[PDB]
Eosinophil cationic protein
Amino acid sequence: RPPQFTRAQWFAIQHISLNPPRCTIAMRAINNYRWRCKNQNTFLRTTFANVVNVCGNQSIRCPHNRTLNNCHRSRFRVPLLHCDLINPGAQNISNCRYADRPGRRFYVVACDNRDPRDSPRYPVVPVHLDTTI
Ligand SMILES: CC(C)O[C@H]1O[C@H](COS(=O)(=O)O)[C@@H](O[C@@H]2O[C@@H](C(=O)O)[C@@H](O[C@H]3O[C@H](COS(=O)(=O)O)[C@@H](O)[C@H](O)[C@H]3NS(=O)(=O)O)[C@H](O)[C@H]2OS(=O)(=O)O)[C@H](O)[C@H]1NS(=O)(=O)O
């Protein structure tokens, strides 16, 4: 487990977001938790349940993937949001400033085992993000 969640929940908390808030808020889930503001982020308007199914679609492979050789793409499209740091010179939350960018595309994810103390029902769960199309 990561310091405050499982890998699979932490992955969801960053990127899986069926009914989000606006970007100035949505970004806080890392930009107010990490030592600097990240410039760009992506937030898929889907359910974790679909993403657990996407870690049971046929196995493909991704750009930065050699330590598992396994990722997958979604079989039909979903809505999303993207966010954008409007002045790259902010490094902290007293000055970092953003705006919204909604969209509908497929997505690409990597995946690994369950957690000893959470939701055993599913042997393999998502855990990272590569791109959207
Ligand atoms: C295992 C753990 C440490 O990894 C998780 O957290 C790190 C940050 O580490 S930290 O929390 O311990 O401090 C996350 O990596 C940071 O986010 C990336 C992201 O893609 O979200 C990086 O983004 C930059 O590069 C992207 C290109 O890579 S690609 O998308 O894979 O092709 C760009 O598209 C993106 O715009 C850009 N953002 S930036 O602000 O301009 O840099 C970023 O490099 C990285 O931070 S850094 O300190 O390493 O530079 C992991 O994503 C995360 N893995 S997770 O647990 O699976 O989610």
